[PDB]
């Protein structure tokens, strides 16, 4: 039940204000099992509608003053299906996943302005082969990055 | 399962960090009751069953029918693979669905080297299955003659009686085996016995070779 999740993500974005990643890698162990956990199916919609949010947001609290984006970059680039490699019952969600992509286009809609010219060729070479290695979407934001990509 | 793939296709680091997340996918099988020392024994992977018997899988893990994995090693023709599940104390002699052993199947793919390190182990030459025939019944059967020969290093008999009656020379005689059936007749097998449909192997062997069967046994 997301019931022990939705603790963990109120109270965790009150307690995560000013601490740096180091606390996040200390949450990696935290949101690992987190994601292993609740088979079910309708109930923790919540728990992974709140805590996406609660590391995207520590995403955003990282990259709101300096960035380097490398360990960021290397953070997701790194692991994608790191809790979705255990779990032998893949329970055929695609609920959160248009808000997990959608979400993180948006984000990189908020910083594909003006941020810094280093770190966008390697995210966005990094995306258009998520597009290959996705296989499977709505097609909409994978036109998305490689349509605002051409515009470049 | 998952791990039938992996095992299946061979993914190295896939297949180590499956088993280093989760030990217990070595332990677990499919519906079929096949491990995955089955199937890696199968697809004939050497570094994944040196894994998996590196951990300490149970050698004797039998299937639903009974299909021990030295019938996999024997039959597999992979000369390593047997090098490792005799090194970890495999069962020379076990029984599978129908009553064979490793034996039968190293046999049928003529591989010398697999048959030197079962009969070397204490592998039984006479081993029958539940049709009473022995290897020298199937290899003479195909046509394996070093094989057979091989089975004479450990001093097999020659005249085992098959579910028929028939021995390895009537099946010698029957696969129209020349050279296989001077060979037997020469290091001892006999001419004497009847099948049960009362046929001496004189009578089976067409084109008068029963003349210079029974002239290679005076002489």
């Known amino acids: 039940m997301a019931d022990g999740g939705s603790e963990r993500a109120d109270g965790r974005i009150v307690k995560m204000e000013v601490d740096y990643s180091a606390t996040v890698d200390q949450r990696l162990p935290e949101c690992a099992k987190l994601a292993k956990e609740g088979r079910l199916q309708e109930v923790i919609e919540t728990l992974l509608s709140l805590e996406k949010q609660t590391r995207t947001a520590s995403d955003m609290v990282s990259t709101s003053r300096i960035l380097v984006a490398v360990v960021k970059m290397c953070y997701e680039a790194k692991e994608w299906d790191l809790l979705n490699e255990n779990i032998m019952l893949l329970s055929k969600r695609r609920s959160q996943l248009k808000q997990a992509v959608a979400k993180m286009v948006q984000q990189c809609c908020t910083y594909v302005e003006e941020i810094t010219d280093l770190p966008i060729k390697l995210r966005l070479i990094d995306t258009l082969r998520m597009v290959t290695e996705g296989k499977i979407y709505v097609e909409i934001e994978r036109a998305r990055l490689t349509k605002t990509l051409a515009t470049i | ?219």
């Open chain 2, 1 to 219: 399962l998952m791990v039938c793939n992996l095992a299946y296709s061979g993914k190295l680091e896939e297949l180590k960090e499956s088993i280093l997340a989760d030990k217990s996918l070595a332990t677990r099988t499919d519906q079929d009751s096949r491990t995955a020392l089955h199937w890696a024994c199968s697809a004939g992977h050497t570094e994944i069953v040196e894994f998996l018997l590196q951990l300490g899988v149970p050698v004797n893990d039998k299937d639903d029918a009974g299909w021990s994995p030295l019938h996999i090693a024997a039959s597999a023709g992979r000369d390593e693979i047997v090098k490792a599940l005799l090194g970890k104390g495999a069962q020379v002699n076990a029984v599978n669905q129908n009553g064979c052993t490793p034996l039968h199947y190293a046999a049928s793919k003529n591989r010398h080297e697999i048959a030197v390190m079962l009969l070397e182990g204490g592998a039984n030459p006479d081993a029958k299955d539940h049709y009473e025939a022995t290897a020298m019944h199937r290899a003479a059967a195909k046509g394996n003659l070093k094989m057979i020969h091989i089975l004479l290093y450990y001093k097999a008999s020659t005249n085992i009686q098959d579910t028929e009656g028939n021995t390895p020379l009537h099946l010698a005689c029957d696969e129209e085996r020349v050279e296989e059936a001077k060979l037997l007749v020469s290091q001892g097998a006999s001419i004497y016995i009847e099948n049960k449909e009362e046929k001496t192997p004189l009578q089976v062997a067409k084109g008068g070779l029963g003349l210079i069967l029974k002239r290679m046994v005076e002489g």
